[PDB]
Amino acid sequence: QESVKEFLAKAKEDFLKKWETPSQNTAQLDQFDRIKTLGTGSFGRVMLVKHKESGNHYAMKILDKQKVVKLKQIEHTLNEKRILQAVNFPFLVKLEFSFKDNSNLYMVMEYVAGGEMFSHLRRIGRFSEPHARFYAAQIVLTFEYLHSLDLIYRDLKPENLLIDQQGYIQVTDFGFAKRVKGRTWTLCGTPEYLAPEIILSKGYNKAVDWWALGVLIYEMAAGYPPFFADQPIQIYEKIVSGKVRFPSHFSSDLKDLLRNLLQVDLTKRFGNLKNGVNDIKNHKWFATTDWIAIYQRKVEAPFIPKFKGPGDTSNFDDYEEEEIRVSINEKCGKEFTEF
Amino acid sequence: TTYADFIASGRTGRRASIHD
Numbered sequence: 001q002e003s004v005k006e007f008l009a010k011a012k013e014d015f016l017k018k019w020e021t022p023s024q025n026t027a028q029l030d031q032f033d034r035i036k037t038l039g040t041g042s043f044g045r046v047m048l049v050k051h052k053e054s055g056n057h058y059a060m061k062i063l064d065k066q067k068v069v070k071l072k073q074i075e076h077t078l079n080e081k082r083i084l085q086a087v088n089f090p091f092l093v094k095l096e097f098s099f100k101d102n103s104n105l106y107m108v109m110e111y112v113a114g115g116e117m118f119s120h121l122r123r124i125g126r127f128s129e130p131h132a133r134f135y136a137a138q139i140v141l142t143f144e145y146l147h148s149l150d151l152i153y154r155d156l157k158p159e160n161l162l163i164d165q166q167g168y169i170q171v172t173d174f175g176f177a178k179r180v181k182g183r184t185w186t187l188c189g190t191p192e193y194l195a196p197e198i199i200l201s202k203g204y205n206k207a208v209d210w211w212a213l214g215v216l217i218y219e220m221a222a223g224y225p226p227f228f229a230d231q232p233i234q235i236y237e238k239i240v241s242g243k244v245r246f247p248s249h250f251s252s253d254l255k256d257l258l259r260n261l262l263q264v265d266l267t268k269r270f271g272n273l274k275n276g277v278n279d280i281k282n283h284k285w286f287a288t289t290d291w292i293a294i295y296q297r298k299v300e301a302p303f304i305p306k307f308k309g310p311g312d313t314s315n316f317d318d319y320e321e322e323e324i325r326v327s328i329n330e331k332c333g334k335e336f337t338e339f
Numbered sequence: 340t341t342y343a344d345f346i347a348s349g350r351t352g353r354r355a356s357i358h359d
């Protein structure tokens with residue numbers, strides 16, 4: 001069953017072509033009517049918009065060029081767009097258009113109306129193992145794909161995982177995604193999901209994404225993360241210790257998988273070994289998982305959000321709106337030339 | 340319980356990423 005090797009090989013050729021000669025200026029602001037904010041993160045906002053000529057809705061990520069510079073995220077933003085436009089996988093949100101003006105950078109993605117896994121997770125409390133397993137399999141295949149292209153995601157979390165109309169995951173936010181061979185050192189990500197090697201400024205690799213998968217699986221199944229506190233600094237102390245505790249309801253299989261993902265020793269962490277991703281795929285916790293079926297989206301979703309219209313946002317919280325300004329003077333022109 | 344302690348903490352809402 002190594003058509004996956006051939007699959008990845010062709011997938012790589014496809015990626016490299018686009019990574020080599022990226023798409024640019026495929027749209028403009030006036031082609032959309034801005035409706036409402038869907039969510040916000042460290043910087044910029046994501047708005048639900050309607051494309052005039054087609055009538056389709058999209059999620060427009062808006063980035064203030066001046067804020068990007070202030071926060072020293074230039075390179076990261078260029079990575080985000082360059083990578084987004086080049087990738088293609090069933091569980092990666094699609095970048096439909098991208099462009100820029102005097103003040104901002106815009107990345108228009110396909111609108112995923114189901115909302116964040118985060119909201120559903122907090123609301124319901126926690127997911128059953130089969131439910132969590134369903135989502136986990138999708139991330140596993142996603143990281144196998146990304147990693148095969150020398151990409152590190154670095155921002156795994158329920159907040160960046162959207163549920164589509166069929167109940168499948170759509171990964172968003174490549175703000176910290178990077179294409180790297182070897183190690184890297186940036187201190188980035190979300191505190192609760194940081195692998196110990198990131199916190200210890202030792203330098204790290206793809207293995208950090210596998211640690212984050214452990215954190216994700218734990219949080220979905222438990223309802224709360226494996227390492228939490230009121231301040232990030234206290235969180236790092238707990239992560240570094242490595243001492244983890246599992247809820248009484250955790251199956252023996254789940255705990256064994258988690259002990260292998262939330263593994264401080266890189267020579268022992270699953271996903272980072274000789275057999276690589278297959279150590280995870282072949283794990284007992286994933287025994288009932290039909291990997292091909294998952295990739296083909298032929299498995300029945302355990303949860304299908306309520307669909308009330310093409311531009312319905314009932315699955316997202318409401319946010320304080322603010323005018324999208326555009327200066328008559330070009331800002332940071334040289335810095336974002338390739339965007 | 341761990342649930343209670345989580346629920347009463349200040350990090351149950353959407354978490355922001357860092358760049359430190």
Ligand SMILES: Nc1ncnc2c1ncn2[C@@H]1O[C@H](COP(=O)(O)OP(=O)(O)O)[C@@H](O)[C@H]1O
Pocket residue numbers: 038039040041042043044045046059061093109110111112113116159160162172173174175316
């Ligand atoms: N394609 C999308 N469809 C629907 N909502 C989205 C989409 N992309 C992002 N969102 C919403 O926007 C939020 C932030 O997106 P993100 O890329 O993380 O931007 P920011 O830089 O503000 O963090 C998400 O957590 C989500 O609620």
